From Swiss-Prot, chain B:
PANTHER family: BIFUNCTIONAL METHYLENETETRAHYDROFOLATE DEHYDROGENASE_CYCLOHYDROLASE, MITOCHONDRIAL, C-1-TETRAHYDROFOLATE SYNTHASE, CYTOPLASMIC-RELATED. This NAD-dependent bifunctional enzyme has very different kinetic properties than the larger NADP-dependent trifunctional enzyme and is unique in that it requires formation of an enzyme-magnesium complex to allow binding of NAD. The gene is MTHFD2. There is a cross-link at K15 (Glycyl lysine isopeptide (Lys-Gly) (interchain with G-Cter in SUMO2)). This is Bifunctional methylenetetrahydrofolate dehydrogenase/cyclohydrolase, mitochondrial. It comes from Homo sapiens (Human).
Length: 294, 289
């Protein structure tokens, strides 16, 4: 059957690296790295997610704090907090949990965060830089995905890859990473990439997946990817994080049970990509702390 | 056989639209738009392209000066020159012709042009905005390809598109425009897009192209696309400009299988220049920032 890849395990490794790198940075007598998180309102998943990131920083020896605010808050307000933090030399990374309330403009918030602290890599300059294959604060989930692939020894160069979904902070950067030149400042995957989305016809999607050596799903649609869609031996990465009921639980976009018996590798949900996301956040924070980039 | 779309005719159309918009704009009492072009060294094609640009400016009533310089220029000189132009409130759009000499950092330059006068759309902020589907100054060849498609009337939503090439200023932006959400600030094609490049083996190219409702070729390789690669009836867009000058496609042959096709010369090339005029008037109007 399919090698199942543990994102839980892989992420724990990665955090171990980070722990050490931070240990080193402090023992050379640099300041201990500080991550600030802003959380607005009360989405319960959102809470869970900050909790995750607060733990991770604890584990790897990074100082954390979560500044909570009521959904009641205004855009101008939020910008002032963000402005406080950009100037607090104690804060190395600054991250704004999403989504924000509809009366706050996400893009403007994202570009408020100083790019040098932008551990989410959602600032316009980081996006620009990533799209031009330059060094940048890479976004965590796409970077996670790439780490899964690169650490499992799965090749990409020359290979056919489909990414379903095209969100600006997951699908598009994944596709950007995977298709680009291995030779540029920020190496990419040199794969041949297909972007699918909410207006791909299921038959046309399937027609592309069937040719795919790697299928990467970030649609947020259960049972989107079924074993009849997948070539034999293929690697299947599940970025989906879908909340259904059967008691209330969580699934990917892959038919795990089906696909597992056709695929050469697969990631579980839970315990695949989610934790890899939190791991790369820790990577970006140490990087931010070392003032490496701009 | 296959309808040959006239790049020349469409570029005429767009140029006419810009001429009118410029006249109204001047007639309302605004400054007549000015575009400066920096030329460096003495590349034959560079010189020809710069002239193609200033020609189109005059045709649509935009003022232009093509400032031509020696390869031997220092990079810091150039940055100082650009800062002049960035600062001259008389310049609305400034574009640096490429390629520059191996001794100068394109990226440092491209990023030195004011985003607000960056008619080529190659400033990192313009690339960023574009990749986030925000309003932005679109790069001209990508926007040209798109206009050719929207104008000819070829649907894109749901459809299957393939793009050969991933250059940061042609192929990648094309692939960006075509796959993204029609609903966004800067709408996109809502197509299903495949990006191929130099590590795509012909086997794989063909395996994708044949399912392609629209194939867009921007690889810079004679004859790359042959009619067995194409699905009969499909739209084929030849963004190639290669000095043997012909395209990336096989014209005569492909022409019989394809539903639509674009020549070379007389295809995308002239459109690229048209869209630059569109961008210069947008610049002059200071809509964006
Ligand atoms: O913190 C986690 C996390 C950790 C572990 C884990 C999961 C998620 C799902 S799991 O596979 O059960 N295990 N994440 C990954 C998913 C995730 N997704 C979003 C989010 C919000 C809106 C839109 C798209 C993504 N914001 C976030 O901040 C996070 C953080
Ligand atoms: O100036 C033209 C142009 C206009 C019309 C036209 C052709 C070319 C070939 S044609 O079909 O004979 N008609 N272009 C389009 C191609 C083009 N290509 C490059 C360029 C820059 C660096 C490297 C390679 C090409 N720089 C440019 O600035 C332009 C502007």
């Amino acid at each position: 059957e399919a090698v199942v890849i543990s994102g839980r395990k892989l992420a724990q490794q990665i955090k171990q690296e980070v722990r050490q790198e931070v240990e080193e940075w402090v023992a050379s007598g640099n300041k201990r790295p500080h991550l600030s998180v802003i959380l607005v309102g009360e989405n319960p998943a959102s809470h869970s997610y900050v909790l995750n990131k607060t733990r991770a920083a604890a584990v790897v020896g990074i100082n954390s704090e979560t500044i909570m605010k009521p959904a009641s808050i205004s855009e101008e307000e939020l910008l002032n907090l963000i402005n406080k933090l950009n100037n607090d030399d104690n804060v190395d990374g600054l991250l704004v949990q999403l989504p924000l309330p509809e009366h706050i403009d996400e893009r403007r918030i994202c570009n408020a965060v100083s790019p040098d602290k932008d551990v989410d890599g959602f600032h316009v300059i980081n996006v620009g830089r990533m799209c031009l294959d330059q060094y940048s604060m890479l976004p965590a989930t796409p970077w996670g995905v790439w780490e899964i692939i690169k650490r499992t020894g799965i090749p990409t160069l020359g290979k056919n890859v489909v990414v379903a979904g095209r969100s600006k902070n997951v699908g598009m950067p994944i596709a950007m990473l995977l298709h680009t030149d291995g030779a540029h400042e920020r190496p990419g995957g040199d794969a041949t990439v297909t972007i699918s989305h909410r207006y791909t016809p299921k038959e046309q999607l399937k027609k592309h997946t069937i040719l795919a050596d790697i299928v990467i799903s970030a649609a947020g649609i259960p049972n989107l990817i079924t074993a009849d869609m997948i070539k034999e031996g293929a690697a299947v990465i599940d970025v989906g994080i879908n909340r259904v009921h059967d008691k209330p639980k969580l699934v990917g976009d892959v038919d795990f049970e089906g696909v597992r018996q056709k695929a050469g590798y697969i990631t579980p949900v839970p315990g695949g990509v989610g934790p890899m996301t939190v791991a790369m956040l820790m990577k970006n924070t140490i990087i931010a702390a070392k003032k490496v980039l701009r």
